[PDB]
Amino acid sequence: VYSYTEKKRIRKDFGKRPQVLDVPYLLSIQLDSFQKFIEQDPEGQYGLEAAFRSVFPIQSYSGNSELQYVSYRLGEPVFDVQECQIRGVTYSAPLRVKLRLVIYEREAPEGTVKDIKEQEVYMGEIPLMTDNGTFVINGTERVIVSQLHRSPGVFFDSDKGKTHSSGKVLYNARIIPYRGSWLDFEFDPKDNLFVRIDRRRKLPATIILRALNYTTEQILDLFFEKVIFEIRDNKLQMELVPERLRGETASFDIEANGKVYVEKGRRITARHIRQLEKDDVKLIEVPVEYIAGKVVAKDYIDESTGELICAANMELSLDLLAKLSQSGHKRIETLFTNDLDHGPYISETLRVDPTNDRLSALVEIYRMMRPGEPPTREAAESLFENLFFSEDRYDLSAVGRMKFNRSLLREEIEGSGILSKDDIIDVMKKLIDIRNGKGEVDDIDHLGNRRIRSVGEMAENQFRVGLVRVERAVKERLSLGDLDTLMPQDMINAKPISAAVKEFFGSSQLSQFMDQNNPLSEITHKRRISALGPGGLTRERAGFEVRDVHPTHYGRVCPIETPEGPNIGLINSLSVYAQTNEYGFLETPYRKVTDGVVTDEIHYLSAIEEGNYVIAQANSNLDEEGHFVEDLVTCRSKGESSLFSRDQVDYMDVSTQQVVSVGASLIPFLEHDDANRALMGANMQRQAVPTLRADKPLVGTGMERAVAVDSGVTAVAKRGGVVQYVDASRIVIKVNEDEMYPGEAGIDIYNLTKYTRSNQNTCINQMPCVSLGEPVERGDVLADGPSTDLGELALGQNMRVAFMPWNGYNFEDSILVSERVVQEDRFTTIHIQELACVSRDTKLGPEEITADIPNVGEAALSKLDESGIVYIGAEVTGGDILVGKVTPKDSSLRVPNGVSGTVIDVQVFTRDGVEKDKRALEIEEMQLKQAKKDLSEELQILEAGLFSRIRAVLVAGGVEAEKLDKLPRDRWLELGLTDEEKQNQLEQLAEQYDELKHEFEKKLEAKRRKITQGDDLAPGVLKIVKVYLAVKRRIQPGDKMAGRHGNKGVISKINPIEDMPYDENGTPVDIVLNPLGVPSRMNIGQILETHLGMAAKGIGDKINAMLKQQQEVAKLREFIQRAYDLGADVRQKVDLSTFSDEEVMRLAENLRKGMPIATPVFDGAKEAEIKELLKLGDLPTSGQIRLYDGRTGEQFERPVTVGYMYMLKLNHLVDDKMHARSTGSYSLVTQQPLGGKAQFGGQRFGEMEVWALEAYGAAYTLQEMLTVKSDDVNGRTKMYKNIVDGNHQMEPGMPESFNVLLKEIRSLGINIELED
Template sequence: MSYSFTEKKRIRKDFSKCPRILEVPYLLATQLESYRRFLQEDVPSERRRPTGLHAALHSVFPISSYSGSAVLEYVDYRLGEPVFDVKECQMRGMTFAAPLRTTLRLVIYDKEAQAGAQSVKDIKEQEVYMGELPLMTRNGTFVINGTERVVVSQLHRSPGVFFEHDKGKTHSSGKLLFSARVIPYRGSWLDFEFDPKDCVFVRIDRRRKLPATILLRALGYSTDEILDAFFETNVFHLSKDAAQLELVPERLRGETASFDIKVKGKVLVEAGRRVTARHIRELEQAGIKTLAVSDDYLIGKTIARDVVDTETGELIVSANDELSADAVEKIRQAGIKEIRTLYTNDFDRGPYMSSTLRIDPTTSELEALVEIYRMMRPGEPPTKEAAQNLFNNLFFSSDRYDLSAVGRMKFNRRLGREEITGPGVLSKEDIIDVLKVLIDIRNGNGYVDDIDHLGNRRIRSVGEMAENVFRIGLVRVERAVRERLSLAESEGLTPQELINAKPVAAAIKEFFGSSQLSQFMDQNNPLSEITHKRRVSALGPGGLTRERAGFEVRDVHPTHYGRVCPIETPEGPNIGLINSLACYARTNEYGFLETPYRKVVDGRATEDVVYLSAIEEGQYVIAQANATLDEKGNLVDDLVSCRHANEFSMSMPDKVDYMDVSPMQIVSVAAGLIPFLEHDDANRALMGSNMQRQAVPTLRAEKPLVGTGMERTVAIDSGTVVVADRGGIVDSVDAGRIVVRVNDEETIPGEAGVDIYNLIKYTRSNQNTSINQRPLVHPGDDIARGDVLADGSSTDMGELALGQNLLVAFMPWHGYNFEDSILISERVVEEDRFTTIHIEELTCVARDTKLGPEEITSDIPNVGEYALSKLDESGIVYIGAEVATGDILVGKVTPKGETQLTPEEKLLRAIFGEKASDVKDTSLRVPSGMDGTVIDVQVFTRDGVEKDQRALEIEKMELASIKKDLNDQLRIVEDDTFHRVERLLIGKTVEGGPGGLKAGSRITEGYLAEVPREKWFEIRLRNEDANRQLEAVAQQIKILRKEFDRRFEEKKAKITAGDDLAPGVLKMVKVYLAVKRRT
């Protein structure tokens, strides 16, 4: 096994019984991949896939005017550079976002053109600003208004068609009432359901129910077509006094014979006996084509077609009517020789659609459309056009209805179709097929779906949610654009004048700022961060509510295995609704969770790893990771414990298809950090995995003596430690930064061969804990890509270290540790084992008031010298000052209104002048119960307001730090360049050069050491190629210096410019206090 630079400093002994086949994948991949697919930032416009932003823009554009003479088309989009980086956004309270610009084309057609031929009159193409789009940081978070937030993934019901029953709860008899539900990604829900009388009803968007045949009539089906679609028919040939049935023997199964069934004079089935499978076989062997039946057999049968007297045109029996003795007699009298009846029985061919047709009040398509209109829009008078438009928009318009790719795939698979792609809207055949499957299930064929199966629930990640929100914003814009497009032609408007992007920006801002799934990041320690980003919630918009969620949806399901952790979930009302992804779980292209398995061929485990979704997994026999293998990878045991079709069973080794990759794959990251988890009780393990997230980083992190191997993965993937982007040699190290000279082979031409890592020093987290990074490397260390360079909070040598290694004894001690009392050694406090540092941010704002501007100053009325001793001349506390409750941090005075002066105030005014009376003290003081050390001060000044001395000092320090970074980068790059020049020059013959270098002499190391480096470029060589190379390098250095100067000026402009503060705010001071809390 190869160890990284940091791992070599602490090598751990691995006691695991199962070798690790697969490394734990990058733990933040779900979040980062999802948002990368949404933006498609690095993909050229012509190669962008129809997902994310691209899909949202395509779904709304082109927008046509009402007359159709003007069309606004979408061409392309691009994201600009963010104005401020992540750190600056956090400091200034801004959103880390990039401007989104879309290229739109306005096409105006000629109205006077001949009918049917469109000729283009004018085309205008323009780039339109569509607002700011928040960007994801490299750690999977968003910075919104200066705070880090996480968008939690949602586990929601997949679009598609689902069949279920009410478990006998609806009707008092306990009869199972079956139903089907078509759930689109967006649009109206369509429900079909049986009632206790076995009629089929339809509901649209859970409104009042209508007979299902009304929907079929609205689709254009007649009574005959409905009966043909759902029933087979029996044909009877009539003669004067008898009837012959065209015999299909299988159709007699289960019927009670009402007459003797004879074959060649021999009675096969006696009257009153049930027809069995043996009788059917005998009838088939006899090869009888027809069977003589009595008229009594015909009575009560349902007619499949209208029976009409061909001579008179009189309707004798309507389709779907039951035959009576009179009707049979009339048919005979009319001379009709053949009639068709519906084939139904009580066994597996119920007369459900026939019964539904009888209670259907409508007879035509228009009546059905009107009935649906009345149900959807009660109280509105229906017209033919309105009813038709409403119905078409419900399920057949791509603007209003979308099954989505995953919905269509699930829909087609459930209906047993071969093709899994198709349109996003429903078709007539789709609705008929859903009804057929529902009737099959009612007849006892087929199965109902388990809605808690992870094949029926999918993950909706941040990118997908952002796409939906962006689409909603665009739809709001569309309405306004369509109205203005009619003016575009007459007034010559451009795309920029047509689009008002505020609704889009508002929708995005609302989603990231206040959505239920956009949450303030839990930043107690690295584990709590990573767990929050890997959380999946069943709550949120379009999901469940904790009041309505039953026991089943919260319960652990067999398909959770390897996908969702069965242990880690909150205690309380959200139990089971909020879960964590298992260590190895990932989402597939449709959003379903997959887990990896090792392929087993003929009882031998191979190295091939395959990811299976919950749908695919049910088809295979899967062994556990701890199944005994010999050295060749063969399964040793005669019977292996396996899972198949969500059940545990024992199986022969040659029947096994796959096996787990690791025993850890069933649990989440937090549960996987608990050593000997298998010996833990499930309830306590749940508490333990939740409590680890509450551990506050201690003053000195201490490595765990016993780990599980996940510690390093969590520390690196959480982003709390500093990891080398490229390999190289450490050039210099101090407490605040690490400079690495990058290896030549890892440097791209034109790129600086130096990496500077600025460390985070005592920064406040979302939970007010301290984030502090400490270097682990020394100058001269040879490091590789991916090595840990510096520890963060709660990490030790690049491993997660949440607590301390203490000796714990379970024993009584004079009753002092009765029940939940704990006795601790004095050394725990003395050695600061559980001492923590918390950082508090206190803000003072100077506003422009009606009475005049507030002022930040050290000249505060009625305050003694001692109280002002920790403030500088600008009225702001010094860094390093130790402050306690009530101490002034920032001196501020506010003008107060003129009031009648008391004698005392008159005296003060006479002694101290005007100042004493017209301002009041509104200084920022240390809140009660808090004391600590001032570790940082930030001063923000509105553009146009003069900066005070303290603000200028802070500015000067920041510029010095940036200058130092850039100088170091330039120094290292220049050193490398001059080394290259030195290698080029040594041993070459010259024409002349500085320092009296004669023509024809050779260059030596000694000569180059004496001549200043800048003069090397004045040397003229005899080799023209070498001269050109020398000139190219000189030019390169010149360009490089100019580039570094430009970057410095850019940073300087950003720092010296005024800050963008809230309206009415002139100046804002943030003071950071480090508070030490001992055990």
Template sequence: FFNPERYDLSGVGRMKFNRRVGRDNSEGVGVLDRDDILDVLSTLINIRNGYGTVDDIDHLGNRRVRSVGEMAENAFRVGLVRVERAVKERLTQAEADNLMPQEMINAKPVAAAVKEFFGSSQLSQFMDQNNPLSEVTHKRRVSALGPGGLTRERAGFEVRDVHPTHYGRVCPIETPEGPNIGLINSLAVYARTNEYGFLETPYRKVKNGKASSDIEYLSAIEESQYVIAQANSELDKAGRFVEELVAVRHKNEFTLASREDVNYMDVSPRQIVSVAAALIPFLEHDDANRALMGSNMQRQAVPTLRAEAPLVGTGIERAVATDSGVTVVARRGGFVDSVDASRIVVRVNDDETTAAEPGVDIYNLTKYTRSNQNTCINQRPLVKSGDQIAAGDVLADGPSTDMGELALGQNLLVAFMPWNGYNFEDSILISERVVKEDRFTTIHIEELQCVARDTKLGPEDITSDIPNVGDAALAKLDESGIAFIGAEVSAGDILVGKVTPKGETQLTPEEKLLRAIFGEKASDVKDTSLRVPPGMDGTVIDVRVFTRDGVEKDLRALSIEKSELEAVRKDLDDTLRILEEDIYERIERMLTGKMAQGGPNKLKSGSKITKGYLEDVPREKWFEIRVKNDDANEQLQKAFERLKAQRDEFDRRFDEKKMKITAGDDLAPGVLKMVKVYLAVKRRIQPGDKMAGRHGNKGVISTIVPVEDMPYLEDGSPVDIVLNPLGVPSRMNVGQVLETHLGWAAKGVGKKIDDMLKAQESVAKLRKFLEEVYNKTGGKVEDVKSLTEAEVVELAGNLTNGVPTATPVFDGATEDEIKGLLELAGLDRSGQSTLYDGRTGEKFDREVTVGYMYMLKLNHLVDDKMHARSTGPYSLVTQQPLGGKAQFGGQRFGEMEVWALEAYGASYTLQEMLTVKSDDVQGRTKMYKNIVDGEHYMDAGMPESFNVLVKEIRSLGINIELETD
């Protein structure tokens, strides 16, 4: 017990131990001493006698977060133990006398242990990169599973349940549905871990009933002793509580307390939920189960072609987009020197640069790159050349971001009404206009790869000379046998031509003669080219060729290398150009007006140096000018040396990059060459695709209706999407209705502003209306008065498509505020409108709830799931078709389906299902031949699975034979 080599309590263990036995200090030795053991015994005896409390295993004070570093350290320690064992073994051997230390220690076990941890640990996961939100939430996930944790089967209800200590630390809403529910959680918005790994959440300090702006983080252990008020408790201007009695939390219970007793106050109403849940407007009006689905489905939204920020947001969209890292954020302030689609060059402000480095920031944008989920990552610049920027500004939008705000879907005009049964059971009906305007068109990038290996019969070759393939099939390949960029390909087209040597076959005399005449031709290689898989078509947008060291590079690989080097050279040239301009500008300022001592172009001693003279002299010769001021001469010399040093440095950097690019690639053993082809696939929205709102209101598109048949409003504008009103009451996600109303009001106000601009109303009128919109309807007060006239007009111009509103969770817009906005927009306070049937022009019987809802297209696309098979691969043993789309398999006809056919008495159908359509080998080949010959009859034989059964029974020692008459 007292030996430190046997065990170590660690800092956390000692802290928890001391706290449990009621000591004040949290430090101590890593082993137990006599006092510790006595304290433990007295605590146990007290509990037995009814004093003290028993620990709650699910309390967050008793559960800690083990971060990557700690787990990597453990893996490293395991590796070191293995090394120690190996060293001890070596030392015990006979010839251990003259061993050197480096001979004894082998670092491989340590490297292997760390590699194994990152490569195959249950917690080392492939990042979910569907959209920026899924990336952020995946990185903020905490799991109770994994090594040293629970297993799904053993975890009971208590572990999975929401605990009072989750408040502000772990989200009670965002967790997966299914077997992992409650075991995998998300961190709350403001939660962080402390030095011991316990989760903490921030609180505002309260003294004598007055809330201060000091913020303190408390862990679950510390929190229970304090009295903590809600974030939306009413405060006066001085920060004092208005009410005498305040709703508080104390010792994990909700109660009322006097305002003088309050110690802390929540920092924000959204602090109890995670990032994904905090993005749902009117979350407080949704049932928890649906909110859970809503926060999980936002992570599955596919980035659309043109991102559109939500009209009704919650105010944290910008923070999520910036923190996800998909946007380009300015590292330092300055002004934009040049912009094109793929890079932004910024000249940094003088006060933000250091003397030794060039004041240039180059941001290379990611263009049409594949994400882990095959969605498209593309960045678009937002700044223009000459713009002044500050550090932290968003320079370019990424996928699913609009002007630096998270934008996962599109704002659609929605009507809640039945329409000919097409929205039965959560089906969704959309207008053809949504398809035509590419509102939900997404780009998916597929990566296909072809590997040329060294085989026993000789190396495989990537070439355009493929046996028995016509010119039409080779039309999209270049001379190296690789598809060129921009080629539009469909299922079955060749992307990379590859031939594999065939085994020597016995040749007939005729073949021998032909061989002798024409030389060796097609027969000794077979075609193993990479083709586009079934059900896929798209455009080749990128090709990467990897060549092993020592293998000659083909023309395509060389041209790719050349273009990469040009891009590197362009970046370095631009940096150097800006640096040179900067140095020459400083020299010009320094020399202008100085007295010369001599210089190029017959510059007389004693004459004054003018701007005109400097313009006539080539810049390189400025360094030959001598002036009467020694300091200036010295500065000139320093500038010359700095310029030369920078040029040398840039040449060195270019050579370094060139080495990296032109070096051979490190490929797997036996691989000579690898080609990766990237296809961009454009997917329009179609029946069968899954869509959802942000409130767990998901559905599948049933049909796409022509614009003229859609229900339309009194002004003739047709709705975009029709949802079933029965999806709301039983699901209890009323948030979607409130979102629809607020979206309708926001759009209505935007339309009103647009009308005012078209009517060329005075700026004063515009200002008055904007003042009313922002400051009379409730919510945050904006300073519209201080804007200049030009700014008012610009603001109004930006609002014509709808006034973006933020309704934070648990602190959102009230019903009255929404009604006020509807009135301001000149719309009915009920939020309902009269609709007309697009096909007949008749009015619908009742008023319909119409408004704008934010809809997402989820990554469950019918194109990825649709699959058909005629003939294809069969299982080796049973000779039955394989299953699944990936194997080009068939549909399983299982036991219960057999019962269904038996119940119908469909005996012939059943027979062909179990024989010629499955594993009767002779029967199915004959059947295929019959169909080709146009004779439609079949003979069923013996299924192969019967033979397998007979063989398996024989393996048990029972000789069984089938006797046929």
């Protein structure tokens, strides 16, 4: 089965690996982020209510007051989306927050409150979205870019290489707080650890171990184990485990029980270790001076005097041995410090430490945080608790604690956001072990070390900024809390809230502006993740590796979609089938594989669990149950591409197209060409400009349908119905009864989008495509939007192409251009320039609006009305005065230079309290009657539906159809009929009728007010009237056009038909390209496009032959069946038998110009299939058919491949790129020409060409350039005199800017002067 709409024009499918998954909904990201953001939801995570539970309740300073949270609510926005876009407001809804105050009594911690009070208090507005997800700020639709950042949490790196040239790596443990200060570790080449907070100085963490109140013995107990010597009978034998003997050389003759095992000088093998462990002897006799090299683990004070014989962090000597021996301390504790196994770092790190107690640690910390203050006890304590123990000042989220536990191989996934000592100590233990030689550092470029934030997350962050500001203000004003008279708005201040949200959506790099020239460009402007923004790095301090792709991106990040130049590999976007973890990672589907059967499911996987498994590729020849024909197969282990066994794999690639993004998805023949030109062609397809007349491509990919659906450019039928009424502006659909509401009748009434202005000054417009009286489908498009061709997305166009040289008109990127195309007008663009005209109240009174325009030409006056505004419909030239705004003594609105157009629309916005003149009131009444007629016809056709439901009730229950229609529609209810749910349904619809009365009255009056009400403007201005122009631009030789292959080009010259080569039929080619562009710029797939489109067009020509020269359904039936079967393994699966034979007429009219052909990305066609179509066509093998010259009329030797190419046009129109300035206005600070084109600016003359002039001897030239033509007013006035005299003589005088800089240094404390 297929859609009845798809029965109009089916696509010839190609694809050999069958699918298990369709295309999911693409705009889920923004919807889910914003919906988890705002919802009346429990449990905090995630969204607004998490921030509310964090910030609330707000209590007093134990001053018997507490403001508690209740709820929040938002009503509708005051306006629509559309007139709001016309208006220049956000589409935002009133944040109405339910809050209750409780205030206690004197000695009432738990006692009775004196007053409670609760209100749903207002606090600002936040923007609601389009159902396409986006926001509009002030008539301008901007898009929030989600930001790639790292993971918050601990990380272990080395930072090797260029550190001190010692051949020595470093090691750094790096903790990233989700909210808090930086805290990282650092060693020496001399092997001692230090710590910093927020890139500050190099001081150890053993001082903060002192600050955590740990003794030296406790620290050595933490980070080390013990080695026990004892004062004994003779020579003080050692307790020994032979694992401690591993990897050593015997200092003396290793002996036990008087038996010799290892000689002195021998290295200890594991042989003798296991032999002595068979023997199991700890106590072994040691020499007295060998222990002098050991360092004691603990302190030893004397027994009699209680005085320190020897402290810890201290090596030994025999005099100390006698001093403790004459006291007789029978325990001696040392550390196992095997210098390859356990480096002695911590003991000597303590040897560095000058501080002793917790308090000197506190003083040193309090000094090093803020230098320039005297030390203070409680201030140091509060500072230390505010470092990483304060919930106010430090936290990591659930993701942060989870990845923290992931770093520690724990079990509990959750915890707090502040630190414990155990956290820091275990991180240090891991760091010591990485210093020792166990464990592995990890790159940042692993995607699990990265994380994309959401719109709701960063919105919650800004919301939290507003919350902490307003709670500081409230706890300020609750200290100012005036009893019995304060209400829950008397301390409110939504101006930080509003200022924060407006600064965020107004001034953010991530909030940037939508690209409206392409539905695909809009959706990839949505589907865009950056490496910049707040918390983002800097491009000028980023290496290659952070820009260059990592194999974790496979199946998750498209490798061939990024901008170039200043930001490469940093604005990388999402793939097709990739999705989003709850924890900000990239879950991704995989076809589960059993022992021999692919499980038909998918399953979502993390980055790190991809290393656990081994994933089968999509082009693996299974046999109908997962029976793969080999047992060894190319897979990856941990992104480790090599051939792997069949019983090893448990997972499989879902799609052959899931590896790329949606921009690459429409690009055929990728498997033959290079990604440079592929990425460039994807960029230029993003750079595409809309045409006038839509037409489908011939090489489809199947992705076009779901992209055109998910892009909001059209009307998807939200219900399945029957077409009732069609107009060019709205289409009425009568809803079928199955999806119909039980009460409140309704029919689908959708309004189109007509000729209107894009964000990029082009023609966004919607076009109907269906017939009246027609079955439709729920979830289906209804009318073509901009650059959409009959339920499909069709950007460019396709034309008659071939490859040969012709007189250098395909020289590098030159484009041979037939006259036939500019006859056919199929690349005319329509542009809309909008201007306004403000009415500011200024000095000497304001400036007026009417046509009192003195001392001007009467032709520009006669175009105006009485009110001073040219009429709608007026084709205008350049420089034409538009609205007369005379100055009190003229600054009238005028047409800019070089532009023409036609007056199409007037919009007026006048300040409230200002009288509108006759044109404004007249067009106001015009639009009033317009919307009045709109609402009236809505009420009347809903009335038609209502009494049609009443008629459908009276089909049964005493039907009197002749006694129905005689009396009018009203009392059709109470005719002869039972007292059932028929008549009760009629009563429901009568209540609906009275509701339509009251509702229509109140909506009509509200619309009267909204049109009537004055417009909020800036202070100073009185009215602003917007102007709309109709600009048409066909083509001119010199603009920039291309195709889908990185094949940039410029139209050189429009050329007649009599220059075009033509076949033996005489049909002239349209555009001819370079042969030499093919081998060097390695994009061979355009030749495949040429052959395939040539064959498809020959098929469509035979179709149009059998169509025009008429022929029955049977022969065309045979031909179309042989066409849609077509050779190899297909999933078309259609038959000609199941057709109404008149849709076949409609689909033949759809095929008379060409054939829709689907093309997979890496399951593309083969050359034998191409030759099959050529034999199915009337077309030869190579396709290099001879042609004949339009000039000489001879056969071209070595004939050329001809065909079609679905070409592309760009928004590089040279009228907005040609700019010249003989003499214009001058800058103020230096009397110099400016730049730009709006400002009529001059060309900047840089210094590279000054050096080029220095390679010449251009003495007069350089002198007249930089002095006369830039800086000196005297030189340019005298040169002006010379030119109006014909004279050629100059005097430079002095560069003014030279004097400017000299007086600037004179403004500095510098005696710089000029001598004689």
